[PDB]
Structure formats: C-alpha cells, structure tokens
Design a protein around this ligand. Structure first.
Ligand SMILES: [Mg+2]
Ligand SMILES: [Mg+2]
Ligand SMILES: [Mg+2]
Ligand SMILES: [Mg+2]
Ligand SMILES: [Mg+2]
Ligand SMILES: [Mg+2]
Ligand SMILES: [Mg+2]
Lengths: 182, 144, 96, 217, 25, 53
RNA sequence: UUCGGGUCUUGUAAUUGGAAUGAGUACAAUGUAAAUACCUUAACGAGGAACAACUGGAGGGCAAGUCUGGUGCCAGCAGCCG
RNA sequence: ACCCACUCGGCACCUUACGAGAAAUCAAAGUCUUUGGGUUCUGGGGGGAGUAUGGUCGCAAGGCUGAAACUUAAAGGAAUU
C-alpha cells in the first residue's frame, strides 16, 4: 500500500508501419547521427510533438493573456537553453517550426563529434559509451545527453582514462608489461 | 428537417433512441447479452486446455483441395467438444489420443479461418510444450 | 497407345464402389473387410469419371480409418487382369 | 523545336507574357502544353498509378492502361491528368501533358498570425467528385500534411506545407479522390475573404494589349 | 423458390406444429 | 503417413558458417552505407535484393 | 594525339596493425539493521572458433527475390484476396 | 357558353439545371464537410428468419411483437461493353 511510482512511455511508434519514404528518411537520419535504433528517432519525435502540443495550446489562447505569457515564455527559455531555438527566434510561433534535426544536432554525441575529439559520429558514440568525455568534470556515459549550450564550452576528455592524460590502462599497460622483462 | 429531434430540451429522446439503435451493432449486442459466457466454447477466454479425443482430417472448401489435419478436442473447463486445427507440415503426428492440448482462437474472432470448414481453433501446446518448438526441433515431447 | 496398371503399396488398398453418395464422396467396399466412406481427393474430381460398381485404388488415411482417399481408377479389362493376378478376391464384375 | 497554333501560345513564344500569373488573372484558355513548360520551368511530374481498364469483345477483351499524373512545383501550381491508352509509356506521357494543360493556382495562407511566408491554406475548402468528398483544413505550422498518401503527394506538389484532411466516401477509388482534392485546391481561389473585399482596376488582357503580335501574317 | 411459396410452406409447417402442440396439451 | 511428407522428403541442407553481421548501431551504419552513401548501381527504380541469374 | 598518372575522394578483401572498453570476475572501501546489488575501484578480462541477437516476413494489402534445390491441387501456406 | 388577361387552390406535365445524386434520374430526391426551421417513425453486411420462444389480439386462418446459436465474403444498387 505504498505510494505508487509514476512511469511514462517516452516514445511513440508510427501510425503506419511500412511507409517506405518515411522509413528511408528515418534510416538517413540514423546514418547522420549514429543512432542505434529507430526507437531513438521516435523518442525525439515524441518530445517534439509534446512541445508542439504545448505551443499550439498557448497560441489558441489570446496573446498578452497571462498563461500564454508565462508558460509559453518558459518553454521558449528552455528551448534556448537547450540550444534548439536560436536567439533570432524567441517567439513561440517559431517553436512550431522546429523539426527533428535540431534535437539530434544537440546530443552529446553530435556535439562531441563537432568539437573535434572524434573523427566521425560512431567514434564519438563509442567514446561516450566507454566513459571517456566529461562535461563539468562529470563523466557522461549517455550518448543522447542534450548539451545545455552554456555547458557546450566545457566538453572535454576525463581526468580518468587515457586521451585526457592518466594511466594508459588494459591493452597499452599489457604491452608495456610485455616489453618490460624482454 | 433531419429525422432526429433537435430542440434544446429533447436530450432524453436522443439518449433513449441511441440506446435502442445500439442493439443493431453486433459487437455491442454480444457484449451486452454476454454471449461470450453463455454460448461460445471458450468461456469468453483467450485460451483453453482440452483432452484429445481423436485426430480427424478435414477436406477444405472449394477452389482448394487438401486434407487439413485437425483434432477433435474436449475442453477441460466445461466439457464442450470442438475441432482444432494443427498448424505446420508434420505436427499432426505430435498429438496422439488422450493428450492434453492448449487451444487458442484462430484469428477471426469466433469465425472460421480460410477454407477449413467448422474449425475455429488452433493447437498451440501439446502435453505442456509448444508445437512450434517441437516443429523447429528445439524441444521434445516428454511422453504422455 | 496403351496405359499401365499400378499395384497397391503399403497404406493403399483395392476398393470397389458400392453407391454414389454426392459432394465428391463415394461409399467404397474395400477388399480388406471394411466398408469405408471414401472421399475423392482432388485429382479425380476433374476428368477420371466414376461408375457404380467400379474398381478404385484407395489410399488409406493413417490416423482415421473410416475416411479414405481415392487415388486411381480401373476399367473392366484392368479389373479382370487384377483378378487373374490374384490381387482381388473374386467378385469384380464390370459390364454396364 | 515548337511552332504555335493559338494566339496565346504565339504571345508566349514572343515573350509578351512573362508569367502564368497573367493567364490566371484573365482566365485565358491554355490549349498548348508548351506554354506551361515555357512559363513554369520547374515542374515535377508524379505518376500516381497505372491500372488496367477492360472492354469485352466477341474475341477476348481489350485492355487499356489508365495513367493518373499529378504535376507541380512548390509555389501554388498543380495539374491533374487522367489518360487512357494501350501503351503504358504513351499513356503516361499523354497524362503528363494533360496535367500541364490543367495547371491551376492555389491560395496559400496562414493559420494564425502572418509571421512570415504562408504555410497552409487560407480557408477550409471542400471538393466533391463521385462520392469522395475531400475536406481540406488550415493547419498550424510544423504539423505537416495530414492526408492519405495520394492526396498528400498532390499537396506536396502544390506547395502547401501544413494541412489537415477529412476525406469521406469511397476514397479507395483513388482517381476520384485525387480529382476531389484537385477541386478543393482550386476552390481556395474563388472564396471571397475580407482581405479581398476591395474593388480593383480591371486590366486589359494580354490578348488585347498585344493583338498585333497575335496571328501569323 | 419464390418468397410467397416459402411463406406458404412455413404456414403449412406451422399448422402441423400447432396440431402437435394441441395433441400434447 | 499422409502427414508431414514434404518435410521428410526434402534434402537436409546445412547452413554455411558465415562471417557474423555487426549487430546494433554498427548494423544500422552498414545499412546506411549500402543505401545512401555508396548509391551503387542505380537503374532509376533503385532495387534492394537483385537476383543473380 | 590512345593510354595514363589517380595528383583528390569513396566502398569492398578469412587481408593485417596498435589503441579503447564493460559483460564478467574480484582485493578493498562504500552501501546496509546485517547483507545483496548499485555507484567507486587495486588485480585479471577481445580478434572471428569469440565476449557469436533474436523475432518475424520477402505476390498484393505492406518494407523486402519471378534466385537455387525439393514437392507436384499432395504435403502444406494463406487474418483477406489467394 | 365561349375569347383574352390576371389571380389564389389542385391533378399533372415540358425544357433547362446554375443545384442534388452511385447513377437511373430529381423543381425536389434542391437551399448538406459552406454540415443545426420543427417534429414522428425506421435501418446498420448476407444468410439463419419474419423462424424459435414468451406475451398479446383472433371462433379459426392468422396478425402485432420478435431472438439467438450457428453460418458466410460477399448479397445488393445503378450503369458498361
Ligand atoms: Mg575508469
Ligand atoms: Mg530467419
Ligand atoms: Mg514463412
Ligand atoms: Mg522462402
Ligand atoms: Mg513491396
Ligand atoms: Mg443483418
Ligand atoms: Mg442490376
């Protein structure tokens, strides 16, 4: 009889399974951003949709009306923080025009790739999974982390691991050992 | 015009009329009369276990011709006798007389499948093990 | 040009038509002891036409014995030949 | 090359008509497909389907192929062509031409607040052909085309970015549906909206300004 | 079969049924 | 027996020991390469599984 | 003038090369009522035969073959059309 | 009593639809995705079946009321060569 825990399904499947063009688009997207699943894409889409729902609702209310002024503004701020909206477009009307690419071009994946540190997206992903790459001296394991624009300045290798300068570890170490008494 | 009443105080008529009409919608009727419990061999349930009486080959409907390999089953829960199709090429010789079998529906919601006349049920599991598993040779039938 | 007579294999039986039932079914008195409800299986619905007291090569259904398949048909000469060879118990009379 | 019958065609060839806009304005009948080509260089041609269409004779049956073609850019211009011929390629080609000939303008509009560049339709518009009624509804930005794939393609061709649909009747007979959609699209111009209230000039037609350039002498 | 004839047949059947019922009673 | 004859008849052909497919994100990458990076041999109507005959 | 260097970019080969890693194990220390497990970590822990992804499909609906054997209105498949 | 012209009410009809409709056709079967004048009744794939049963009304024949199991991928409409 303890208080229930809240779950939420964070993605939504397409309403039509084998829409070929759509499928191809999805594939292309995956290729672009080193996505393990269509599931990731779906998640992103769902997120976008949620935002859109909010925005539309806000629009439906009169402009300069309190609720719109507040909630909508907050949403806009959030978007700007995340780095999906640009400073030109703090508008709420522009929130509807966002599209899936802007969210994917903001993952700790893509960001990692686009700052050096990588050589292709797959490599970056591997690095992320492998516990290389820290943000604010905090090692991030998550490929789809959503880099918060002000933290984007701080993406670097960890103080642990090689690459960012510590003990080589595992394979290199083994090699060294082998070299040692020979 | 339009057959329905429209007036701001009609409401009741709209309700009652709708209720009356609803009975022409078959699914609704089924739900309300409770024909899933009173009739139907499965007691409104997704699956049922039964004991194999005998193995019967059934001749398919027209355009087609082939002996289908079904099984006459008597269900444990009520005692009603039903025909159940045994899917896949071998499989009929996995069954035998006096064997406990798990039957699902066919996939037509009470109606008969394809060309097999009077058969409304699949065979899923014999003596506790999946037919598919047996067929693919992933497990063996642990006698009866 | 001539046709050949084909002998019965294991799971097969020589039968005679007793009566015309309908829907593609024939009551067959098998030369074994049993009088079975022999269902005409696909191939002989098409062209190979039955009579009344004709000899038919019946394939026995392994799991269910009262119902059986009909595979092949013989005329009168063929029947006689079979009798001579000792394939049939002697009562095969085809002259219609 | 090309040598034109019809005055309009001749005018087009001359260069006296700069855009199809003028033609649209003066409701001038486009009867040569080359005019369209000249004036709209950027037309994408989408073949919707090819279906068999049969006629019983004493010996066998004559089968013909019905080609349904939609044509357009992304700037409010669409054509729809139905053509039956025995050869499939030929049918397709003819259909394309027909579509081009048809080509219609679209009243693209805003959902709410005219922020920048119209995305949707200006009004809720319906079109009816056969039994198929296709209702098209102005959608908010970034909602996409919400349509049965056939209609969706047409919408895309037209250049509508965001639109809701409510296709009713026997939509499965695709040709009819397409026709209905086309009709609906057409209807967008011909709706008298408050931002069109005020009376204008009535310009002399390009068929009358350049009457001398018309006719081969 | 004509619908009228079917109806007639049904009626005939019903007469017999009625008779049977009466007998039972 | 009438039942299960075709299966019995068929020659028991064994699966060839192959190099394993790179499962996951790698697989997706591979697919992408096959389709939209290489764009190898395009007929107009771009085919997926062509027959070797 | 025929090549071709291929100066630049791509894919494919049981070719070959150093790097990276947690899945496991495991000193410890956390954790904990005492423990598990997590999070943290000394030590071990990757080269195809491994540290092997399955589940369903490839006529249409509906993404994907008129490839190769077998079967021959049979065995079967097929929600529907077949 | 005719004749002409107008006018209400009626049985219809003729031609066009600019409207409807799947079409045959329709001055309503129009003023319906540009959907709301007021209202009563009836239908919700085809069979089973206007059957079974229970009422009720009939001297009786019958009427009014009226199922389900099960069955089936069509039954139908208008037009086409
Ligand atoms: Mg570490
Ligand atoms: Mg497989
Ligand atoms: Mg299969
Ligand atoms: Mg296959
Ligand atoms: Mg396909
Ligand atoms: Mg009904
Ligand atoms: Mg008719």
């Amino acid at each position: 009889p303890r208080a229930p825990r809240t779950y939420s399904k964070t993605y939504s499947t397409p309403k039509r399974p084998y829409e070929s063009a759509r499928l191809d688009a999805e594939l292309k997207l995956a290729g672009e951003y080193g996505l393990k699943n269509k599931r990731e894409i779906y998640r992103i889409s769902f997120q976008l949709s949620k935002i859109r729902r909010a925005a539309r609702d806000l629009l439906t209310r009169d402009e300069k009306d309190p609720k719109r002024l507040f909630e909508g503004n907050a949403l806009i701020r959030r978007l700007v923080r995340i780095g999906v909206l640009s400073e030109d477009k703090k508008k709420l009307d522009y929130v509807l025009a966002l599209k899936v690419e802007d969210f994917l071009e903001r993952r700790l994946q893509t960001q990692v790739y686009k700052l050096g540190l990588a050589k292709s997206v797959h490599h970056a992903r591997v690095l992320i999974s492998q516990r290389h790459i820290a943000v604010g001296k905090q090692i991030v394991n998550i490929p789809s982390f959503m880099v918060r624009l002000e933290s984007e300045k701080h993406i670097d290798f960890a103080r642990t691991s090689p690459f960012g300068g510590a003990r080589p570890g595992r394979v290199a170490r083994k090699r060294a050992a082998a070299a040692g008494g020979e | 015009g339009k057959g329905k009443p429209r007036g701001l105080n009609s409401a009741r008529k709209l309700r009652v009329h709708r209720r009356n009409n609803r009975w022409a919608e078959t699914t609704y009727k089924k739900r309300l009369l409770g024909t899933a419990f009173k009739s139907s061999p499965f007691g409104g349930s997704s699956h049922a276990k039964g004991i194999v009486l005998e193995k019967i080959g059934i001749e398919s409907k027209q355009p087609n011709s082939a002996i289908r390999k079904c099984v006459r089953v008597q269900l444990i829960k009520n005692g009603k006798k039903v025909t159940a199709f045994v899917p896949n090429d071998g499989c009929l010789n996995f069954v035998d007389e006096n064997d406990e079998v798990l039957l699902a529906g066919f996939g037509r919601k009470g109606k008969a499948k394809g060309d097999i006349p009077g058969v409304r049920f699949k065979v899923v599991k014999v003596s506790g093990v999946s037919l598919l598993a047996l067929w693919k040779e992933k497990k063996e039938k642990p006698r009866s | 040009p001539k046709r050949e007579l084909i002998y019965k294999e294991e799971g097969q039986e020589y039968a005679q038509i007793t009566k015309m039932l309908g829907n593609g079914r024939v009551e067959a008195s098998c030369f074994d002891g049993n009088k079975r409800m022999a269902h005409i299986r696909g191939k002989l619905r098409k062209k190979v036409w039955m009579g009344q007291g004709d000899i038919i090569l019946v394939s026995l259904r392994d799991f269910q014995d009262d119902q059986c398949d009909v595979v092949h048909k013989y005329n009168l000469d063929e029947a006689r030949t079979l009798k001579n060879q000792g394939e049939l118990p002697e009562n095969a009379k085809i002259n219609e | 090359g090309w040598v034109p019958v019809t005055k309009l065609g001749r005018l087009v060839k001359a260069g006296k008509i700069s855009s199809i806009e003028e033609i649209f304005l003066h409701s001038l009948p486009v009867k040569e497909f080359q005019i369209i080509d000249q004036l709209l260089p950027n037309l994408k041609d989408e073949v919707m389907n090819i279906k068999p269409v049969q006629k019983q004779t004493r010996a066998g049956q004559r089968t013909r192929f019905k080609a349904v073609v939609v044509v357009g850019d992304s700037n409010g211009h669409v054509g729809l062509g139905i053509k039956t011929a025995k050869e499939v390629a030929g049918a397709i080609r003819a259909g394309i031409i027909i579509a081009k000939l048809s080509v219609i303008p679209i009243r693209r509009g805003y959902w709410g607040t005219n922020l920048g560049q119209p995305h949707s339709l200006a009004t809720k518009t319906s079109g009816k052909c056969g039994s198929v009624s296709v209702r098209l509804i102005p959608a908010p930005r970034g909602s996409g085309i919400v349509a049965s794939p056939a209609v969706k393609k047409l919408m895309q061709l037209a250049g509508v970015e965001d639109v809701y649909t409510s296709s009713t009747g026997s939509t499965r007979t695709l040709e009819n549906t397409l026709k209905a959609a086309f009709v609906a699209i057409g209807n967008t111009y011909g709706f008298l909206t408050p931002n069109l209230w005020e009376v204008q000039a009535l310009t002399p037609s390009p068929m009358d300004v350049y009457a001398d350039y018309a006719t081969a002498s | 079969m004509r619908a009228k004839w079917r109806k007639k047949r049904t009626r005939r059947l019903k007469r017999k049924r009625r008779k049977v019922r009466a007998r039972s009673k | 027996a009438r039942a299960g004859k075709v299966k019995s008849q068929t020659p028991k052909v064994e699966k060839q020991e192959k190099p394993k497919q790179p499962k996951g994100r790698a697989y997706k990458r591979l697919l992408y390469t096959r389709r939209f990076v290489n764009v190898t041999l395009t007929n107009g109507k771009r085919k997926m599984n062509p027959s070797p005959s």
